Amino acid sequence: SYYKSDPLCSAVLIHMKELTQHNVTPEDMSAFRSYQKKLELSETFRKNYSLEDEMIYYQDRLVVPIKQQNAVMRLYHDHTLFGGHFGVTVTLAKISPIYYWPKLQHSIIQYIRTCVQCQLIKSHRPRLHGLLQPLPIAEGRWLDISMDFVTGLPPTSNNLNMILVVVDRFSKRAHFIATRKATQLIDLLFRYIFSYHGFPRTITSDRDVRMTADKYQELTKRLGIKSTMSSANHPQTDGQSERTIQTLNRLLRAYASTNIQNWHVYLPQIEFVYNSTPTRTLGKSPFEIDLGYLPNTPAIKSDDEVNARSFTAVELAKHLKALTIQTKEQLEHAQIEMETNNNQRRKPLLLNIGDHVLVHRDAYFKKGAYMKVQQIYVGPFRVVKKINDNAYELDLNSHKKKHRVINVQFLKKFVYRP
Amino acid sequence: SYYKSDPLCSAVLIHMKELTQHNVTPEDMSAFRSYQKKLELSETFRKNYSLEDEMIYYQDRLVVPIKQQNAVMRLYHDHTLFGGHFGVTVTLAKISPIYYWPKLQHSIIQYIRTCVQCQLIKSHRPRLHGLLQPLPIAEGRWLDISMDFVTGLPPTSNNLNMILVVVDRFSKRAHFIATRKTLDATQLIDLLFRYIFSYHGFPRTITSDRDVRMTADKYQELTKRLGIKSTMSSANHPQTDGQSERTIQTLNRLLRAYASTNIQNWHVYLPQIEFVYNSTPTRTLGKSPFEIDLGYLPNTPAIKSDDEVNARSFTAVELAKHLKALTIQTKEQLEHAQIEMETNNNQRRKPLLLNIGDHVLVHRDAYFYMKVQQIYVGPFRVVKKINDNAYELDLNSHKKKHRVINVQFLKKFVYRPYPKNKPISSTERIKRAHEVTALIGIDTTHKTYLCHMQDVDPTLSVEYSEAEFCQIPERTRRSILA
DNA sequence: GAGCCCGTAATACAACAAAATCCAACAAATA
DNA sequence: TATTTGTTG
DNA sequence: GGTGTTGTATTACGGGCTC
DNA sequence: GGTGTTGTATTACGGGCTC
């Protein structure tokens, strides 16, 4: 039960094979590509096709007619003759030692994008699927605020359990919100610690139940506060707070190495140390990014001046304007530097309407659902809206899934074939 | 109540600041470097020091004498005036706006290395410590072998291990047989299917992990009587079993491909996955692992355009010559593979070189709520240097579990530094017990606690028994152990 | 080209990516 | 001799 | 509307010397 | 003695044409 026991006088290679035969030319519809290929063969000298008793082949490899292309690549890709659904390299190593197939690599990668199980099972670095495209930089001071918290720490005396952080996107000002892992009184403690400065414009946070929080969201809609609400298991958007708790974790380890179970005393020292230390992407201390009144003043900084903003009373407007201008251009510099050092391999994905994208078992099933060697056979979903440049909402075929926003790091767009 | 309100007429900067005054030359022992620096200043033109009535400083930066170098770096790196124990960049951003410091960044990284807590609380890419050294290349058809376990597989007949993958390292034949956790623990039946695998040829070298199924006394001694080495891993360093784990990575994709009937009936798929994976050509050798060892390919011949040599199923007296030729081919492909691995991986990695005796931190795998507490532990003395990236060390007294740590967890320790002395008398272990810093634990063999004191030799601990343990407040001691 | 000192100063590279329970199973410690 | 308790895929 | 982001050793580029 | 390692899209380099 072997193949190639069939003559085909109507295919692309007929023009190539009549270079010796010159007998019959029964071309088909859309066979004008064969005419152009024969013209290119005529103006060049690459004649290596061998014609031996109906076996027309290349120098050592069997050229296959285009009628049975899919049959051959399915035979050497599926388990009919022990393929195994591998990549283009193993498929070439199975086919190219035996067959030639002009533009074989493009045909094989097209088949990889065609075969459904390879789309659902393979990953092929599904963490580089969209550009960086960071947050818009800022406005006037204390208008954008980043919100997140680490769920659990070694508990203190039974009054405090975990640390919440507030750092603004502009100035990156540390904060010490020590919660109890909380209730609807989140707005009480949160209000007491941001309203020390004032009400922001948008909150960059995750889809956490203390902030998804239909009771708390309506408060923000009434008050005039937006909510970015980073999607399920995509904590990258929170950013400044995540980077702060990275710096806080080192600081908390430093100040509580031998002093576990009472770190709530040292937490204001943690935030004050974070506040007094200059950063890199802005080059100035977060006091200086705000009203520059580093109160410790161990020594005067470089370019010695008055450096006493307490003496200035009415002229603070020009000083804050100057700080705002230089910090805004520094934020733009940080944005472009991040975009340069990150997008060296980040391939974009821009669809925005009418596709059948997937979600490869991350933010689709539960974060608490165990990942194992169980098959990854998420069905072909649909996309109806372009919610952002780096995400697309889906019509999750479930009860509700409680969210339908999927960042591009889980999509891996499905492609059909007739 | 600040610094710099004191004269220092004998330091390095004396020759620099007598370029305008030329009063006295009160050099000290080994202070001729000041004269050489003055000569270097004279033969060039970088004279920009400002000198006004003992306020001697740079164009905008206060130059500091070498006597109070430690005072300045401790002031702007520790917490006396709100430092924070940050990196070299933040320390520069605190110091370089205010002070000059010839070779400033070198002094800053020196202070980062010679700190007491700063080494142990932070981290800087520990994974790339040690250059990537591939294991010995190949032998006569899997005299070197690897195996490993992964779990999390769904049950079908109470079989939630089912991955005992054995990879024939030379030919990469890569067998894996269904099993379970509860069948054996290297006592009764584990060896039996190990031998039915080994029925097709005994190996000569194992490379495996620190799993309890192979660190047992029964396994090591039987392998030693079999003349086959163990060569275990290094306390959660699975990269020693890399080729088996890479086979698992290839196996997992094929397992998901064949795992549509996840729960009902799928134990027939592992031999199918074996037969598919062995027949598929690899990348590092260009030949399928099935035909590398066995010569020929499996049934339904799809013989390539090389020759008829891959249909070698005929008379066997001439198999030795061309099978050795294929051994040469595959050997060459594995030097190519070792070179390819060492190219793209050693570009960022930096080797770590320690002699026997110097202290070393382990930073992990010493105590298994490890978030805020001091997960990183104190320094230990290295005993045996097995490899350039393998140091055997005394993490505890004599307790348990294979006291060798890979260099990825290991980190250098520097004790360059008013430190106290070493108590050796019997009465000095009682009074000098309130000067403790950290804790290791309790000896399992007898009643002797090991801990760290303050401003002493860190690794060279002093034994503190119960006669001098209950007097000092131990309420804050078990807090870091729990 | 050719290298060196030194002084700044950019520069990819990785860590924040929820936290903490055991599962199965080797061998130490009493009583 | 059963119930523990260190560490590790 | 809504989607990364800085700390850190490490390393690259100008004044001043030898040419 | 004892310590990574291949699968995979993706992309870079020679024969043959226009010069």
mmCIF file of N, CA and C in Angstrom, chain A residues 244-328:
data_model
loop_
_atom_site.group_PDB
_atom_site.id
_atom_site.type_symbol
_atom_site.label_atom_id
_atom_site.label_comp_id
_atom_site.label_asym_id
_atom_site.label_seq_id
_atom_site.Cartn_x
_atom_site.Cartn_y
_atom_site.Cartn_z
ATOM 1 N N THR A 244 8.420 48.230 43.554
ATOM 2 C CA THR A 244 8.629 48.718 44.910
ATOM 3 C C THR A 244 8.644 47.575 45.917
ATOM 4 N N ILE A 245 7.714 46.618 45.794
ATOM 5 C CA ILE A 245 7.722 45.479 46.713
ATOM 6 C C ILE A 245 8.902 44.566 46.429
ATOM 7 N N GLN A 246 9.455 44.607 45.213
ATOM 8 C CA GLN A 246 10.761 43.998 44.993
ATOM 9 C C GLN A 246 11.823 44.689 45.833
ATOM 10 N N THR A 247 11.854 46.020 45.781
ATOM 11 C CA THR A 247 12.792 46.764 46.612
ATOM 12 C C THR A 247 12.405 46.694 48.085
ATOM 13 N N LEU A 248 11.103 46.628 48.378
ATOM 14 C CA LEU A 248 10.662 46.512 49.766
ATOM 15 C C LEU A 248 11.057 45.166 50.361
ATOM 16 N N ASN A 249 10.972 44.090 49.568
ATOM 17 C CA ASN A 249 11.313 42.758 50.065
ATOM 18 C C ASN A 249 12.766 42.690 50.507
ATOM 19 N N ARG A 250 13.670 43.265 49.713
ATOM 20 C CA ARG A 250 15.067 43.355 50.119
ATOM 21 C C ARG A 250 15.215 44.231 51.358
ATOM 22 N N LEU A 251 14.509 45.365 51.388
ATOM 23 C CA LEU A 251 14.569 46.250 52.547
ATOM 24 C C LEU A 251 13.973 45.591 53.784
ATOM 25 N N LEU A 252 12.863 44.869 53.615
ATOM 26 C CA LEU A 252 12.227 44.218 54.755
ATOM 27 C C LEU A 252 13.080 43.068 55.273
ATOM 28 N N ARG A 253 13.759 42.352 54.371
ATOM 29 C CA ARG A 253 14.720 41.341 54.797
ATOM 30 C C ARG A 253 15.893 41.974 55.535
ATOM 31 N N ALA A 254 16.355 43.134 55.061
ATOM 32 C CA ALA A 254 17.470 43.819 55.707
ATOM 33 C C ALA A 254 17.107 44.285 57.109
ATOM 34 N N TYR A 255 15.910 44.838 57.276
ATOM 35 C CA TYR A 255 15.503 45.388 58.561
ATOM 36 C C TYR A 255 14.833 44.370 59.473
ATOM 37 N N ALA A 256 14.530 43.171 58.977
ATOM 38 C CA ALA A 256 13.851 42.167 59.784
ATOM 39 C C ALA A 256 14.481 40.792 59.609
ATOM 40 N N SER A 257 15.802 40.741 59.422
ATOM 41 C CA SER A 257 16.489 39.457 59.337
ATOM 42 C C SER A 257 16.453 38.731 60.675
ATOM 43 N N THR A 258 16.836 39.421 61.746
ATOM 44 C CA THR A 258 16.795 38.878 63.095
ATOM 45 C C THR A 258 15.576 39.342 63.878
ATOM 46 N N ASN A 259 14.668 40.078 63.246
ATOM 47 C CA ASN A 259 13.545 40.723 63.919
ATOM 48 C C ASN A 259 12.245 40.431 63.185
ATOM 49 N N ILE A 260 11.991 39.148 62.925
ATOM 50 C CA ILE A 260 10.722 38.687 62.371
ATOM 51 C C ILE A 260 9.631 38.916 63.416
ATOM 52 N N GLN A 261 8.369 38.924 62.977
ATOM 53 C CA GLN A 261 7.135 38.958 63.765
ATOM 54 C C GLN A 261 6.872 40.344 64.356
ATOM 55 N N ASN A 262 7.759 41.314 64.147
ATOM 56 C CA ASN A 262 7.477 42.699 64.512
ATOM 57 C C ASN A 262 8.003 43.651 63.446
ATOM 58 N N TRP A 263 7.763 43.335 62.171
ATOM 59 C CA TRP A 263 8.239 44.188 61.088
ATOM 60 C C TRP A 263 7.349 45.400 60.845
ATOM 61 N N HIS A 264 6.182 45.467 61.491
ATOM 62 C CA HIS A 264 5.311 46.625 61.341
ATOM 63 C C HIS A 264 5.908 47.873 61.971
ATOM 64 N N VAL A 265 6.797 47.711 62.952
ATOM 65 C CA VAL A 265 7.530 48.853 63.483
ATOM 66 C C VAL A 265 8.512 49.380 62.443
ATOM 67 N N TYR A 266 9.179 48.479 61.722
ATOM 68 C CA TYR A 266 10.193 48.893 60.760
ATOM 69 C C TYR A 266 9.619 49.302 59.409
ATOM 70 N N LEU A 267 8.344 49.003 59.137
ATOM 71 C CA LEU A 267 7.739 49.374 57.854
ATOM 72 C C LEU A 267 7.778 50.874 57.537
ATOM 73 N N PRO A 268 7.493 51.807 58.469
ATOM 74 C CA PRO A 268 7.753 53.223 58.143
ATOM 75 C C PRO A 268 9.209 53.523 57.842
ATOM 76 N N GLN A 269 10.147 52.831 58.494
ATOM 77 C CA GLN A 269 11.553 53.004 58.143
ATOM 78 C C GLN A 269 11.832 52.479 56.743
ATOM 79 N N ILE A 270 11.161 51.387 56.354
ATOM 80 C CA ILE A 270 11.299 50.853 54.999
ATOM 81 C C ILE A 270 10.860 51.890 53.975
ATOM 82 N N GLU A 271 9.687 52.486 54.195
ATOM 83 C CA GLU A 271 9.172 53.441 53.219
ATOM 84 C C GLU A 271 9.968 54.741 53.230
ATOM 85 N N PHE A 272 10.451 55.171 54.399
ATOM 86 C CA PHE A 272 11.262 56.383 54.451
ATOM 87 C C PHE A 272 12.612 56.175 53.776
ATOM 88 N N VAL A 273 13.198 54.983 53.924
ATOM 89 C CA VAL A 273 14.450 54.678 53.242
ATOM 90 C C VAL A 273 14.238 54.623 51.734
ATOM 91 N N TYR A 274 13.155 53.976 51.284
ATOM 92 C CA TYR A 274 12.828 53.968 49.858
ATOM 93 C C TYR A 274 12.596 55.381 49.340
ATOM 94 N N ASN A 275 12.028 56.245 50.177
ATOM 95 C CA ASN A 275 11.728 57.607 49.761
ATOM 96 C C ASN A 275 12.988 58.459 49.672
ATOM 97 N N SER A 276 13.939 58.253 50.581
ATOM 98 C CA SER A 276 15.141 59.078 50.597
ATOM 99 C C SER A 276 16.197 58.635 49.591
ATOM 100 N N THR A 277 16.106 57.420 49.052
ATOM 101 C CA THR A 277 17.126 56.918 48.136
ATOM 102 C C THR A 277 16.773 57.278 46.701
ATOM 103 N N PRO A 278 17.658 57.951 45.963
ATOM 104 C CA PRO A 278 17.382 58.240 44.552
ATOM 105 C C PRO A 278 17.306 56.972 43.714
ATOM 106 N N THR A 279 16.454 57.016 42.697
ATOM 107 C CA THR A 279 16.282 55.908 41.773
ATOM 108 C C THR A 279 17.152 56.130 40.537
ATOM 109 N N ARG A 280 17.010 55.257 39.541
ATOM 110 C CA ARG A 280 17.803 55.323 38.320
ATOM 111 C C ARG A 280 17.039 55.923 37.151
ATOM 112 N N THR A 281 15.796 55.488 36.931
ATOM 113 C CA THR A 281 14.999 55.982 35.814
ATOM 114 C C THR A 281 14.590 57.438 35.971
ATOM 115 N N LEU A 282 14.709 58.005 37.170
ATOM 116 C CA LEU A 282 14.502 59.429 37.372
ATOM 117 C C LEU A 282 15.743 60.152 37.861
ATOM 118 N N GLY A 283 16.675 59.456 38.508
ATOM 119 C CA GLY A 283 17.922 60.047 38.944
ATOM 120 C C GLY A 283 17.833 60.903 40.185
ATOM 121 N N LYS A 284 16.637 61.107 40.732
ATOM 122 C CA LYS A 284 16.438 61.947 41.900
ATOM 123 C C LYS A 284 15.669 61.165 42.954
ATOM 124 N N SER A 285 15.787 61.618 44.197
ATOM 125 C CA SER A 285 15.011 61.033 45.279
ATOM 126 C C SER A 285 13.531 61.354 45.089
ATOM 127 N N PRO A 286 12.631 60.432 45.445
ATOM 128 C CA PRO A 286 11.190 60.712 45.314
ATOM 129 C C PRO A 286 10.689 61.891 46.139
ATOM 130 N N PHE A 287 11.398 62.301 47.195
ATOM 131 C CA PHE A 287 11.156 63.632 47.745
ATOM 132 C C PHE A 287 11.447 64.719 46.721
ATOM 133 N N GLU A 288 12.563 64.611 45.999
ATOM 134 C CA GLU A 288 12.901 65.659 45.043
ATOM 135 C C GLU A 288 12.003 65.621 43.812
ATOM 136 N N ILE A 289 11.454 64.453 43.469
ATOM 137 C CA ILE A 289 10.471 64.397 42.390
ATOM 138 C C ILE A 289 9.179 65.084 42.814
ATOM 139 N N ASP A 290 8.800 64.935 44.084
ATOM 140 C CA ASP A 290 7.771 65.770 44.695
ATOM 141 C C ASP A 290 8.376 67.101 45.115
ATOM 142 N N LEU A 291 7.682 67.829 45.991
ATOM 143 C CA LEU A 291 8.280 68.976 46.664
ATOM 144 C C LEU A 291 9.594 68.564 47.320
ATOM 145 N N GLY A 292 10.690 69.174 46.879
ATOM 146 C CA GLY A 292 11.970 68.615 47.252
ATOM 147 C C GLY A 292 12.378 69.106 48.617
ATOM 148 N N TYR A 293 12.031 68.319 49.625
ATOM 149 C CA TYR A 293 12.281 68.670 51.013
ATOM 150 C C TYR A 293 12.774 67.454 51.781
ATOM 151 N N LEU A 294 13.831 66.814 51.268
ATOM 152 C CA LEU A 294 14.586 65.816 52.020
ATOM 153 C C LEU A 294 14.936 66.392 53.388
ATOM 154 N N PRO A 295 14.304 65.909 54.460
ATOM 155 C CA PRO A 295 14.389 66.614 55.745
ATOM 156 C C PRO A 295 15.634 66.261 56.538
ATOM 157 N N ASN A 296 16.255 65.137 56.185
ATOM 158 C CA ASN A 296 17.407 64.646 56.927
ATOM 159 C C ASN A 296 18.614 65.551 56.733
ATOM 160 N N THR A 297 18.850 65.985 55.482
ATOM 161 C CA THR A 297 19.985 66.742 54.942
ATOM 162 C C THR A 297 21.321 66.418 55.621
ATOM 163 N N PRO A 298 21.832 65.182 55.475
ATOM 164 C CA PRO A 298 23.162 64.877 56.035
ATOM 165 C C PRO A 298 24.267 65.729 55.439
ATOM 166 N N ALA A 299 24.161 66.043 54.151
ATOM 167 C CA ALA A 299 25.066 66.964 53.483
ATOM 168 C C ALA A 299 24.353 67.514 52.259
ATOM 169 N N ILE A 300 24.782 68.700 51.828
ATOM 170 C CA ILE A 300 24.200 69.310 50.641
ATOM 171 C C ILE A 300 24.644 68.542 49.403
ATOM 172 N N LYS A 301 23.737 68.411 48.438
ATOM 173 C CA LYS A 301 24.018 67.651 47.230
ATOM 174 C C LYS A 301 24.907 68.475 46.292
ATOM 175 N N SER A 302 25.223 67.897 45.134
ATOM 176 C CA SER A 302 26.045 68.579 44.144
ATOM 177 C C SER A 302 25.298 69.776 43.564
ATOM 178 N N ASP A 303 26.069 70.696 42.975
ATOM 179 C CA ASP A 303 25.601 72.019 42.554
ATOM 180 C C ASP A 303 24.950 72.744 43.735
ATOM 181 N N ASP A 304 25.805 73.047 44.716
ATOM 182 C CA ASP A 304 25.367 73.636 45.976
ATOM 183 C C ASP A 304 24.655 74.963 45.750
ATOM 184 N N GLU A 305 23.510 75.115 46.404
ATOM 185 C CA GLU A 305 22.625 76.253 46.223
ATOM 186 C C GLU A 305 21.990 76.522 47.584
ATOM 187 N N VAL A 306 20.882 77.264 47.597
ATOM 188 C CA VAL A 306 20.130 77.455 48.835
ATOM 189 C C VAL A 306 19.620 76.117 49.352
ATOM 190 N N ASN A 307 19.012 75.323 48.461
ATOM 191 C CA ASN A 307 18.537 73.958 48.725
ATOM 192 C C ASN A 307 17.556 73.883 49.896
ATOM 193 N N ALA A 308 16.934 75.005 50.248
ATOM 194 C CA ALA A 308 16.022 75.103 51.382
ATOM 195 C C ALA A 308 14.682 75.573 50.835
ATOM 196 N N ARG A 309 13.840 74.615 50.443
ATOM 197 C CA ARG A 309 12.542 74.936 49.862
ATOM 198 C C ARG A 309 11.552 75.450 50.898
ATOM 199 N N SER A 310 11.891 75.365 52.185
ATOM 200 C CA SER A 310 11.069 75.980 53.220
ATOM 201 C C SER A 310 11.101 77.499 53.125
ATOM 202 N N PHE A 311 12.254 78.063 52.754
ATOM 203 C CA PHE A 311 12.367 79.510 52.614
ATOM 204 C C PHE A 311 11.479 80.027 51.489
ATOM 205 N N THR A 312 11.392 79.279 50.392
ATOM 206 C CA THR A 312 10.508 79.656 49.300
ATOM 207 C C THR A 312 9.059 79.481 49.739
ATOM 208 N N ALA A 313 8.240 80.507 49.503
ATOM 209 C CA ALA A 313 6.858 80.528 49.972
ATOM 210 C C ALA A 313 5.848 80.607 48.840
ATOM 211 N N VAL A 314 6.012 81.555 47.921
ATOM 212 C CA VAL A 314 5.082 81.728 46.820
ATOM 213 C C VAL A 314 5.655 81.232 45.496
ATOM 214 N N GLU A 315 6.973 81.275 45.322
ATOM 215 C CA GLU A 315 7.663 80.883 44.097
ATOM 216 C C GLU A 315 7.739 79.373 43.896
ATOM 217 N N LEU A 316 7.016 78.536 44.649
ATOM 218 C CA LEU A 316 7.104 77.092 44.453
ATOM 219 C C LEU A 316 6.525 76.645 43.120
ATOM 220 N N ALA A 317 5.692 77.474 42.481
ATOM 221 C CA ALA A 317 5.057 77.088 41.224
ATOM 222 C C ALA A 317 6.088 76.872 40.121
ATOM 223 N N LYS A 318 7.055 77.784 40.005
ATOM 224 C CA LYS A 318 8.087 77.637 38.985
ATOM 225 C C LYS A 318 9.004 76.459 39.293
ATOM 226 N N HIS A 319 9.290 76.226 40.576
ATOM 227 C CA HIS A 319 10.128 75.093 40.959
ATOM 228 C C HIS A 319 9.449 73.764 40.647
ATOM 229 N N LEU A 320 8.157 73.647 40.969
ATOM 230 C CA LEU A 320 7.435 72.419 40.659
ATOM 231 C C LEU A 320 7.263 72.255 39.155
ATOM 232 N N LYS A 321 7.115 73.364 38.423
ATOM 233 C CA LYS A 321 7.042 73.288 36.968
ATOM 234 C C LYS A 321 8.350 72.783 36.372
ATOM 235 N N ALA A 322 9.483 73.276 36.881
ATOM 236 C CA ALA A 322 10.785 72.817 36.404
ATOM 237 C C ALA A 322 11.003 71.343 36.715
ATOM 238 N N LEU A 323 10.673 70.933 37.945
ATOM 239 C CA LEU A 323 10.792 69.529 38.322
ATOM 240 C C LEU A 323 9.876 68.658 37.478
ATOM 241 N N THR A 324 8.656 69.135 37.214
ATOM 242 C CA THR A 324 7.713 68.396 36.385
ATOM 243 C C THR A 324 8.238 68.225 34.968
ATOM 244 N N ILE A 325 8.821 69.279 34.393
ATOM 245 C CA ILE A 325 9.321 69.202 33.019
ATOM 246 C C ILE A 325 10.481 68.216 32.921
ATOM 247 N N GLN A 326 11.461 68.337 33.826
ATOM 248 C CA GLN A 326 12.624 67.458 33.736
ATOM 249 C C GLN A 326 12.263 66.015 34.075
ATOM 250 N N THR A 327 11.347 65.807 35.022
ATOM 251 C CA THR A 327 10.942 64.449 35.356
ATOM 252 C C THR A 327 10.058 63.847 34.272
ATOM 253 N N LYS A 328 9.280 64.672 33.567
ATOM 254 C CA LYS A 328 8.501 64.173 32.439
ATOM 255 C C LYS A 328 9.408 63.722 31.304
#
